[model samples]
Target: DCHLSDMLQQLHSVNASKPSERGLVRQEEAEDPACIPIFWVSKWVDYSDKYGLGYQLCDNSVGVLFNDSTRLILYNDGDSLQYIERDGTESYLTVSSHPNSLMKKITLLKYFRNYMSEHLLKAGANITLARLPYLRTWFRTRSAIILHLSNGSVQINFFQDHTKLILCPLMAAVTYIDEKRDFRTYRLSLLEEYGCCKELASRLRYARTMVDKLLS
Candidate 1:
């Protein structure tokens, strides 16, 4: 429960506002009922009963992206019923909280690295070998991370920093891919839509290679 609250606060604190002629909004502005910024939120719920404790625990994490930055919130609920025996009655307890260990970030980075490596290698002779510039470009354009849990279930949320024209293509590409549908297809589409075709081919090629090496 404690971990869950911490994650929620982190998510809510993301800077989702774009810079404008009026200047950035102050923290006090956020307090205004009418001043909420546009943000995308995603939630994941999980329930497990593998242990012999005879209780079920559920955990949830919500993510929001603002101005190319990502934030996350997590919540947990535990429940159980009392059982009566010949001696008396026994109560069961369930424990849960948001799990935001540093390991989660590492897991996300690993996935991103693998994806970049595979994509670059598959790009073949058409792509250049220089990696640093490509990585910088990719980093500027995309913001994503793996949501970690021991279960097979995972949730991913993507938001494009729309303050500039450069990010519009990335935003459109992500929208074209649905989380419920095929994630791989969406990823490949992102590569095709915004990669070499967007006058960024050389950079994309290099970025993929660099991420691959770093993750390895």
Candidate 2:
């Protein structure tokens, strides 16, 4: 249930099980001081043909929700919010907020939290993300808290695992790579001083090119 030596021992065995058979060479080098990634928001959201099947999500409970979509207002109730997903399924969550003339600030200031507690629970992390108030000696166990660094870096400790998945912070307006708008992928990026995206792509490409250059 935690990241102890035994859990790591299982990983050592799994990786040691088959090097020739599975081609997954396994080894464990202890990290005296674990490494954490530095995160920040990008200034822009660039678009090209290189994209994926992006999604449109809705958060209308506290009434700060929208995405890039052709909203076909079939029959919206006067007291609810609706988002018809691409698969023709209706997603309606009733709300007590105003439909128009609305000014609501729902979530955090400049940080968006990707609540993936259930996703990790079934996989292995096995901890609900509501609250745990982790080891007073260490940091983040299972608490829904966003740490904003002074240099405008947003930090969140989602798991006990000592790695933070840097996400795109430059979630700007929709940029459709598709012309017909049928096979389209648009990213909703927003920012003022912090976001969690695009930096990954740049860093990855930066590493890849540098490595290739060195090896070649």
Candidate 3:
């Protein structure tokens, strides 16, 4: 009874792609208590050549991943600090208690902060935080840059086009943004029941392909 059915019919007609029998599967939606709630990337900038990557979470926390492989997070809008070691250990401190060892890192973190604030615009809403989601790994293909977060959410930004797909696999949800900057979040279950537009279908397909690469 939804436009998804029509969209699927159209896509099926052009079955020039592989014929997969698992197109339609009825699955019940169950919330898993242990599932990490997905967090969207609010803003990001890459300075990997000299510094590293800087990103602001939807919760207003800013973090800088340094070239030395260490990471420092500024929470409460630069009041507190969380330094993550290369071995994944974490140390917390107040901004007022600046350690001699972290002097350089803290300075660079501020520079990254200023750059993001003056240049980039936030991409998502300010949401609540349980555990802060950080970028785990990322890879760039010819077509897009894919960001894999610590909470198992993947965000892909495509080139030569203004489109992005943020896939939260654990929750079976995907958020899509188009050229016009419109945002839509789709549950994979609903997508199975009701077909999606071609734009979403293609982006979802690419996301799946990249996820496979990440898995293998």
Candidate 4:
């Protein structure tokens, strides 16, 4: 097992907060005759005042945006999960001190990566069973990666940055990881119920809750 059962609740809660916010890779995409969408369960989303805006609960980079002269401001650190932004004027500080599960996510990736590497070395077998395929696909699209173990296998979806971890089993993973029901309907209902910005309504209507943040 990918121990996904343990992670799903938290994942869903975040996805719930913002339906369109990046969580697992696109289900259909992952299920497709695929590229490298199997490396990490979570997408390496850069921080934005948009998706799950306030708290930085993910990987790669974190940043906030503004209105006039607004540009992305990524988290900064020389050593830990650093992502610098424009002209040294804006950047996120290390939130290691915060009790938000955000920081923990980063730690999990490091441990998971080490665990995978150790497993491969100790097995003394052809760990690169399908490495070429993963590499080729990644080289092209920079998608996820696939790893095959003796007992089972997993597909990772991530940016290979600080916040990254794969959790899955193809079919079941999609059901548990992605929305169990069709989201377009839910999204439409939301738009219909609590009309949003006429400008962004057409697009944000299908996006997650956090997109509007205050919409219903």
Candidate 5:
């Protein structure tokens, strides 16, 4: 228990430290390069009910890992990482190397890489053929190795349609307004262009507004 607590402490300690502004870009600024639109996608997927629980995702970049909860345990990928915390602000830990902690640093990187890869495989199968037809083929064709860190662990499924990606983390966190039910629903919006579908976007916009309103 103490070891677990210590691990948790270490995780929180890292989380408390503000990420350096250098090489760090805000969500709005990230949209300019079309580099997978990290910011909007990150914000769209953030769902932690407790402030300061979020992860980062980059487009087409390989081997990105994030924590699913404030507990500091690593997840397979950004999307799975998003599901861990359903509400609040999240801080990221910067990866760095120090001469005194070379082994620790290497271990951290290895753990992060392994965790992220596992998450992608876990989530990949669930992506619907209708939503992301290419995903199945993408996974099947890739030569990327799948490393099983532990034996007999349940094969967790975190799959969703591409558009539904926006909502998974949010809904998993239970953050959204249900007007018909006259209450807050937890569903999130996944589409980049919310206005593409009149009814869908409008409804999602309203939900988005509710989220912002609550956060503000």
Candidate 6:
């Protein structure tokens, strides 16, 4: 269904064909930062059983994907809000401009806002935003949460180790933030041609499985 899945499938086939080449290698390349769209969850709190998932994007925007299936985002440091309906249509409004229909959602948004502000330390560089990508769907596994964004990005947040992998299918690349919190990017082509770290390749395999599940 996506280029990432296709890439993974081909890689698997290649590896299967050459049993002796069944190891991973790290190949680094330098590319323009502007060419890579860096986006990730800076912080997240899951109250999904009760309220839904709350996450802070790398740009400092706060968002909550509510249990009822709609989403609300607080941006510009809560001065403005972006409301996305269940159908994914977006409307921008401010606290002063919000209607009675938005009252409860706004309250929950602020609660997430305060909680993240008080409890979680921010991750990655504070970047400027044209706009944050909207989350499309997500999946929960025993070890990780797979987040699919509107902009063709897939982020896997690992629980026990606290590492993250953001896949930019559109760019044919991935950004990995290790337990040490060092961020690195690797092109998918490089990965298939030269392999990658066992940890990263393993996650990519899991990510591909998740993508296949999503497409199926």
Residue ranges of candidate 4 with Cα displaced over 4 Å: 1-30, 36-57, 75-177, 180-216
Tens-digit per-residue lDDT, 1-216, candidate 1: 233233222222221111121233222222222211112112221111221111111111122121222222211221221222223233322223223443353234333333433432211111112110000111222444223221111123233421111111112211112223211212223233222222123223332333343234
State each model's CA lDDT, in order: 0.23, 0.22, 0.67, 0.27, 0.24, 0.73
Q: Give me the candidate number with maximum TM-score.
A: 6
- TM agreement with the true structure for every prediction: 0.19, 0.16, 0.76, 0.19, 0.26, 0.85
Q: What would the per-residue lDDT of candidate 4 be over residues 59-157, giving only the tens digit for each residue?
A: 222222221222232322413433223343433334354335345444443443334333321110111122111110111125332222211223232
Report the lDDT of model 5 for residue 139.
Answer: 11
Prediction 2 global C-alpha lDDT: 0.22
Q: Over the full model, what C-alpha lDDT does candidate 4 score relative to the true structure?
A: 0.27
Model 5, 1-216: lDDT tens per residue? 222223223323322332222243232221221111111111111222322222222232222122332222223342222111224343334234223423443344355444444554222221111111001000110211111111100011112212221222211211111222121222111123111223333433333333232223
lDDT of 3 by residue, 1-216 (tens): 132233333333323332233364322231122333347677787888898888887677888877777788888556789888888798988668978999888888888777877777676552224478666666778898877776667788887786887766555666676787766666655565545566666776776667666665
- Winner on lDDT between 2 and 5 is 5
Question: Judged by TM-score relative to the true structure, which candidate is superior, 3 or 5?
Answer: 3
State candidate 1's TM-score.
Answer: 0.19
**Backbone collisions counted per model:** 9, 11, 2, 11, 18, 0
- The candidate that wins on lDDT is 6
Predicted candidate 6 versus true structure: per-residue lDDT over 81-132, tens digit per residue: 9999998789898987878999998999899998988888776663333347
Which of the two, 5 or 6, has more TM-score?
Answer: 6
Off by over 4 Å in 2: 19-216
